Design a protein around this ligand. Structure first.
Ligand SMILES: CC(=O)N[C@@H](CO)C(=O)O
Ligand SMILES: CC(=O)N[C@@H](CO)C(=O)O
Ligand SMILES: CC(=O)N[C@@H](CO)C(=O)O
Ligand SMILES: CC(=O)N[C@@H](CO)C(=O)O
Lengths: 323, 324, 324, 323
């Protein structure tokens, strides 16, 4: 059978079985129509229309099922012509970044907003994880980039690109013995129960270093992997939170008290990282310099071309990285 | 657009993008098909296939949508001719079923005999195969029904009707250690070389689940599609078969012991099923009911109007189906 | 054989066969560990690891068995110390839970507050992650409990206790086409770019099933592990989010509309679970009951004595769990 | 803690809390035992044994749980020493053959019985399928060999190794108008309803050829992919079966009647096939010559070395292949 026959029998019913009126609507002749209809009935060996004279009188019981399915065939062919084009698919590439939650929510949404404007057909996949985990996916071949924010010793066999420096705040409820006070100390911090990151104390971290040096041992009551849970947890009593300062601002967090701890702990450096055997696509270079605006193609190319991350550190020695 | 163009592109996929093979298949020539393909591409404004040189390498994203719809169009066309058949002469036509060797050999022979006796002018065609091939046969228009025994996620796009639940046996030669000793644990079973289906272990079968639960890995020496090959292999040494309990006959299977493996592996469910676009002729409703007594005509049509195989399951929630 | 040797080989696997990384991790030196490893190999008469030059390339079949057992041995050792803790001072210790961002942010804060109030000398450690990482944390001894929201086949080796059923929402900016129009079909949804979890589409999730049923393929522009990232992304243009309905607040989520996607995707089930080898301290039973009221102590111990998570399910068959 | 401590406390309970008797059984001294026990209790900070004098009096409530788990630790360590060796695993290789059911049940069980004796650590995987399917897996990379028994036009881009020739029988029930008769004909075959293979009639097959040439059209009532179902189906009435002669023998099939059809249809040739880009392992060469004993390594090497299957056909031109 042909699509055309199907069109003709549906149309003959739209026009109330008037074949002459069918012809005018379809820009053809009554013999044209009638030839196709009769050919279809011959092919199928069943009458789709009852006739009395030359005249169509009605659709036969069987014809009614054929016309119903025929209407479905037509509708589907339209649907074929409606199938959207190759530019609706994001198959121009895929970028897999392993990073932190604060980085993805307070840092990168400003970058993501850009990368997607430029590359609307590259798909973007932000995996989160402990410093340990972040570093493992890059090695394993599961991730393109690694945005290490600390414990950068784990990101060992990877290019290391300094992006900025960050500082740990102390967070407390408004009513807390620290909420009204000006500056606070290491000794009188360790006095309180501590709420911080799950990987915060490992035996080599900075939080640790500041307690081992002071011969103090802190009382940890709650840890989480994500800062937003540390903060939600501090909607309670006596605990003291120890997270990134960028994880708290008084606009979103008016129910909390952000409080300098800049002179209490050493500072950290969020680097970006990736395997050396990875062809840097355009969208890759793009993400890097969207995150850190000084990591322009040339800087990166100049950076990777070297032999050791010591040499990149050497390279940025006397340049004030952002804060 | 033309039906022939939709046939051609569907057949190209059916033939694994091998256009020389397609052309032999439809008794025309490669240039005939390519011209038709390219015109469709031109007409739609969409490449259906990625290309290399003279080779087709893959169906594109957009091509995939177009092709899916093309498959529906052609199945509708075959429904038109089936409706005419039904009205012209109800007791005359053909039924194609795709299933496994065990279903054919042990669940169907009776059912078939009955049917052929009632419908001597209906030709019946039984394809045997793996879950993947059963799904394939229904997809390429080679089969009206699937009778599927496991891996039911391969049939989410079909209407599938529950038939019965079944369980597996461990089966060995009478010498074998497990014969003499009582019941068998997964830890015990894991220490021997396993004989089972090619789709026995897939990463997500009932056999996988039992082994993942115990944190064990199976030692697989021999697989086959057909439970009957597997059964001949066990005529030797240490190998332990893992197959359906109904593939073994306490009478006509005299050289094999049949150990209770109901407590190692969970049961599977056998379903019979079709594309929603298949016109259900009277002999087809009969075939379903003869295979599965509780699938009366109203039960079927009731089941077809629902949205999901999960909704169909719900229909049968306050019933207990046969165990086999 | 020595405990230290079993620690070492387990840690080598935990560290992805990276022995330099292992050695840094346990504050000793690579030669220390290699010597211990090789001696174990020598003692057992089995290479645990395949090697290349100075590199470990994979764990061998036999090595895999040995390692699985080694993991049990070490968990038993930690059970000994947990029992001593329980008897010496019940209200003092640590609880480690691994779960998703939404569980932490929206199902736990209350539950936690209650617990910390009753047990001020129990430190609580909440790891957030993907189904794969939740399973990983319990396997490497980093977590006492998993609260798993989907992909439950990743936990066949744990005792898992049903908590509640949950469903997903389609979520968009108020401009978006779908806002204005009524209910949404999968065919409609498939025509937009999707925003969902990194484990949203796996080949066997609830999202896959809905799409396979309709014969459609999703256009995935953005994934993230955390429902909250996904929610910030939808502050833009066309992208349509597919996430849990409880990750969205008709109050504190004011820039997003929440479309009924209960009729596109089937529900999932949130379970809480542990290795059978974990000694259940009193505060742990409390944590379970506080999270899931119907998991009383007897219900738990009743559930642990059963053989399967499927048997556990059966316990709850004549009950209807909470929907969230 | 150490395994040794665990051993000591379990053993002290096996010996009914007599430490001196424990020492003799373990070839050590009472101070030896007692040092480890006390060290464990110190590590755990809980008493495993109640004491009255120097004497053990009983296992404490907590000690009873520790000794129970300790017994489980010991048992597991034994289980480690019981883990079977690398020679219990079939990881020396895997062979994926795509063939027919008759071939796998009446032909290859004699070969399989051999291959497994020689290679007990190569796993063997027999996939079955329509001639079409058999040929597709080889191409796709899912199979190592293809044992085509007919429609060898599908096995196009593959090495083709003739193994033997086979002939189609006719099968019927004892009571059938053909059961007592001697020889039968093409015309009076087409008189009956036909039970044969699902791919039997394609438009190029031999069954076809013999009917197109004779200007006859047969009445097909039942097809199956497997011969055993064709035969089981012929436990009925009037149908006539058309399958391989090797698929029927009067020992297994006494309820049937096998009946020459050698002069009614052309003969077929079961070849073995494989991609040219496939390194023939030892177990591969082995299977080929176990199936066809004349396809010895040298024959195969001599066979593949050529350029066209026409040349292999040329090569076997005047050699009587088996039957
Ligand atoms: C800047 C940042 O994201 N810091 C981490 C801490 O490593 C965080 O998740 O807060
Ligand atoms: C009951 C049944 O047919 N089972 C399949 C395997 O799922 C078989 O072929 O034996
Ligand atoms: C209800 C829930 O927690 N769902 C997961 C996804 O399965 C989430 O993180 O949102
Ligand atoms: C020899 C053989 O196996 N022949 C096929 C027919 O192609 C069969 O399955 O009987």
């Amino acid at each position: 059978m042909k699509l055309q026959q199907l069109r003709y029998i549906v149309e003959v019913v739209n026009h109330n079985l008037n074949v002459s009126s069918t012809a005018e609507g379809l820009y053809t002749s009554q013999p044209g129509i009638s030839k196709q209809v009769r050919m279809l009935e011959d092919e199928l060996g069943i009458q789709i229309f009852a006739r009395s004279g030359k005249h169509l009188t009605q659709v036969t019981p069987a014809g009614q099922e054929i016309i119903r399915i025929a209407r479905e065939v037509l509708s589907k062919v339209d649907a074929i012509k409606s199938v959207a084009g190759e530019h609706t698919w994001p198959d121009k590439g895929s970028l897999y970044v392993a990073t932190t939650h604060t980085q993805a929510r307070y840092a990168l949404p400003g970058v993501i907003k850009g990368f997607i404007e430029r590359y609307p057909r590259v798909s973007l996949h932000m995996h989160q994880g402990s410093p340990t985990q972040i570093a493992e996916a890059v090695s394993k071949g599961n991730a393109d980039f690694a945005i290490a924010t600390e414990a950068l010793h784990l990101y060992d066999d990877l290019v290391m690109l300094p992006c900025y420096h960050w500082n740990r705040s102390i967070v407390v409820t408004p009513e807390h013995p620290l909420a009204t006070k000006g500056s606070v100390s290491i000794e009188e911090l360790a006095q309180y129960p501590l709420v911080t990151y799950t990987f915060g104390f490992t035996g080599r971290s900075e939080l640790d270093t500041a307690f081992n040096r002071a011969g103090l041992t802190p009382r940890i009551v709650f840890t989480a992997t994500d800062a937003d849970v540390i903060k939600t947890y501090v909607r309670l009593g006596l605990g003291v939170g120890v997270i990134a300062s960028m994880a708290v601002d008084p606009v979103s967090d008016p129910d909390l008290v952000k409080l300098d701890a800049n002179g209490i702990f050493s500072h950290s450096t969020t680097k970006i990282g990736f395997r050396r055997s990875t062809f840097l696509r355009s969208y890759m270079y793009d993400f890097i310099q969207r995150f850190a605006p000084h990591l322009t193609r040339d800087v990166v190319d100049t950076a990777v071309a070297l032999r050791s991350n010591e040499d990149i550190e050497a390279m940025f020695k006397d340049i004030k990285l952002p804060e």
